[PDB]
Amino acid sequence: QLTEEQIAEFKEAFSLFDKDGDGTITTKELGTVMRSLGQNPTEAELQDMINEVDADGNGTIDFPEFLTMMARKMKDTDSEEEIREAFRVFDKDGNGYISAAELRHVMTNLGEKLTDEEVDEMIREADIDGDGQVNYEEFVQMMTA
């Protein structure tokens, strides 16, 4: 099932959305994240995203709700289609491969400046076939591990 380290890591991920640290993710905090991922969702779109995770319908996402989704979806095998959306966030030029520069771009936008050596290490870790880049199959493994 879900391990105690997965719980801790899902909580760290939650806290990166929950930027004022009040224990609930608002549409406003969700907006901040989506924009740093290169998107610009409207208020209606932000509220409808909240609907996906907000189980009691109070308009925000608390950690138990966030955890319920993360834990349930990881047991799923039918998230290919969502991972494909996640892929396109990284693959900015749309060429089917995530480059070092594309990886660093997304990482620095989320609040992490990495050296050219650190980005290379991440690509190297994910790169199974050796083209020095990340295709979809390799990206699945880096979102699924």
Partner: peptide, 17 residues
């Protein structure tokens, strides 16, 4: 879109760590 963002944020933090 939201779950994609959640997976990404998880990857991001664990990349930092």
């Amino acid at each position: 879109k939201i779950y994609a963002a959640m997976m990404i944020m998880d990857y991001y933090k664990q990349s930092k760590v």
